[PDB]
Symmetry: D3
Subunit: 129 residues, 6 copies
C-alpha cells in the first residue's frame, strides 16, 4: 500500500549512515555508495541539497568526506524529506472532493507528518542488526 | 506516497453516501453517481466486491437500491480499502534490509493504517452536513 | 500528465474496432483480441461496463455491435465508464487563483478533446 | 484524471511569485519559500535550471534576490515546463498502438501545448 | 519500470498456492486469502478472468486448469494485466535511441515466458 | 507493459549522440537539444551527474562542448542509468511477499541488469 521514492529512501540512507558514524570523523560518499550498492554519482545529486540546507557538511582532503551539520537528535526525518522532496502529500486532495474524504486525507497527512517530525536521526541510528 | 486509486476514492464515496442516508431507505447507484458527477456504470464496477464483502446490501424493486450491510460505526475506511485495493500493510523493501534504514517507512505505514482502521463510516458522515 | 490506464487504452481499441465494422454484423471479442495481439480474457473485463452503459450490445448466437451510431459516441463517453471522471485535478488547500489557473486550463483542454472526438472520426484512421 | 508534478507545480509557483513582484525589486528565494510553506533548499533545485535558461536573473548583494529574465507577458507556462520537465507528452504513445489511438494522443498533446504556449506569466499573475 | 499492479501480484499468489496444492483436492479463495493475510473479496475479483482463460477450474474451491509445468507467469500476467510487449515510444523513433528499451522489453518477456508454476512452487514460505 | 523514465530516456539520448559523434570534436548541448526537440536547460540537469561520473568531459571555449569520457565500447547503458536513476529495480519487492514472487522479481531484475551491462554505447550507436 505504501510507496517510498528513491530520492527519499536514499537521502535518508545517507543521513542514517552519517548519524551512525557521528563523532567518528568524515565519511566519504564513495564508502556510503559501496555499503549501499549504488553509484556515488547518484548519491552526489541527493547530498547537494542536504549540504545547501546545512544538514551535512563537506570536509575536504584525502581523509575528507561528509559529517552531519548538527547533532543526530537535532535532525528529523521530516527536515530531510522537506529538502529533498518538498511538501508531504500522502493522498492528493482533488478539486471539488467531498469534505468527508478531504478530512480523511488531512488525518492521514497529519499522522505521516507527526511520524516525520517526531523521528530524529539519533532514533533511527539506534536500530542495529 | 500512499497508493489509493480512483477505485478506492469512489468506493469510499459510495459508502459515505450510504452512511449519510442510513435508516432512510435504499439509495440507487444512479442517484449517488448523479450527486457526485460520475458514471453510474463506473460506480457499478465498485459495488460488486463491496456487496460480496457484506459492506453493502442490494434491495430489489422500483424503490430499491443499496443500504449499508452494518451500522456506520462498524465499518472503517480500512475495511473498504482492503476489499477494493488489497492489503494496507505492504511497503516497498530492499532485499536483506537493515533495521535502521527500514524503520521510518514502517512507522509511516503503521500511522497510515491506524488512521484507516480508526476512521469509521460514522466518523466520515460526521465530517459533513 | 494524463493517466489513461491499460483499461482505457483497450476499451478504446474495442470501440474503434466496432466502429470500423459498424453495419457489418457482430464482431467477437476473440476476433478483436486476435487483431490486437492480446488476451480475449483481458478484453472480457472491459466489455461488461461498456455493455451496462449501452455503448455496446451483445448479439446472442454472434458477438458485439455499437449501442449507437459511431458519430454519437465520444472518447469521453468511453473513458468516463472505464476510468472514472475526467475533471478532478490535484489541488492545494486554500489555493490561490493565479497558482491553480494553468492546471484548470489544461484540464478543460483535455476534456474538450475527449468530449469532441467521436468514434466516426477515429474510425477514419487506418493501418 | 490530470496529474500535476511537484517540479512543475513549484517551478511555476516561483515564476508566478516573481511575476506578482515584477518592478518591486529583487525577491529572495527564502521569502518565496516562506510564502509557500516550502524549504528554500527544495526551491533552489528548481531555480538553477530557470536561471540557466535566462527565465530568472539573480541580483547580488545585501538587498539581492531574483527578478524575471524578461517581462511577464514574454514568458509562457510552456517555456517554464519545458526547462523543468522536458517535452510535453500528456499520454505516452506505445509501440504498435493503432493509428486511431495515436491520433487521439496527438490531439490531447496539441491541446495541452496550445494552453501552455498561449498562457503567459502576466496572464497567471492577473488572477487575484 | 513494469506495469505489474496489485492485480498481477495477487493473481500470481492464487496460481502459486494452487500449484503447491496440485493433486491435493480443491482450495478455497478463503484459505488462500487467510494464508496470505488479505481480503477474500479482493481475490474474488481476480479469479473470474483466470477461470475464463481456463487457468483455474472451479469445483468448494479451485484447482489448476493444467499441470504446473504447463502454466507460465506470462500466461497469468497477460490475462490480468494485458500485453507484455508494448513499450513507450517517441513518434519517428530512431533505431539507435529505441534499441535499449526494446532489448529490456524482450528480456522481461523472456523471464515471464520461461518461468512456470512448477518452478515457482519449489520456493517455500 | 514497460515504462521508460524521462531522465533515463534523455540521459541515454545525450550519450548516444556523443557516441555517434565520437572523434568528431566537441558537441554542444545546444545542438543535442536542437536535434532532439527539447530544452538545452532540461538536458543540462542530466549532463552534470554524467560529467561528475567521468562519462562525459567538457571541452572549454567558443568551439567547445562535450565528448565521451571513454571509448564508446567502454561505456554501458547500465553505467549511465545507475548514475542518473540509481539502482535497477523493475518490480518493487514488498514486505512479506512470498519467496516465489520475490524470486520472480529478482529474475526480472537480473535479466534487465544483464541487458544494461552487456549493451555498450558502441552497440547503440551502430544502429
Ligand atoms: Cl565525499
Ligand atoms: Cl535569493
Ligand atoms: Cl555545451
Amino acid at each position: 500500500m505504501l510507496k517510498i521514492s528513491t530520492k527519499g529512501r536514499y537521502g535518508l540512507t545517507i543521513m542514517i549512515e552519517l548519524a551512525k558514524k557521528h563523532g567518528e570523523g568524515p565519511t566519504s560518499l564513495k564508502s556510503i555508495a559501496q555499503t549501499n550498492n549504488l553509484s556515488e554519482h547518484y548519491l552526489e545529486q541527493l547530498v547537494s541539497p542536504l549540504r545547501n540546507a546545512g544538514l551535512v557538511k563537506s570536509i575536504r582532503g584525502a581523509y575528507g568526506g561528509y559529517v552531519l551539520g548538527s547533532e543526530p537528535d537535532a535532525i528529523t526525518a521530516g527536515d530531510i524529506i522537506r529538502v529533498l522532496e518538498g511538501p508531504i502529500s500522502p493522498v492528493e486532495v482533488l478539486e471539488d472532493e467531498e469534505p468527508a474524504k478531504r478530512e480523511l486525507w488531512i488525518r492521514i497527512r497529519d499522522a505521516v507528518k507527526e511520524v516525520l517530525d517526531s523521528t530524529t536521526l539519533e532514533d533511527l541510528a539506534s536500530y542495529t542488526d
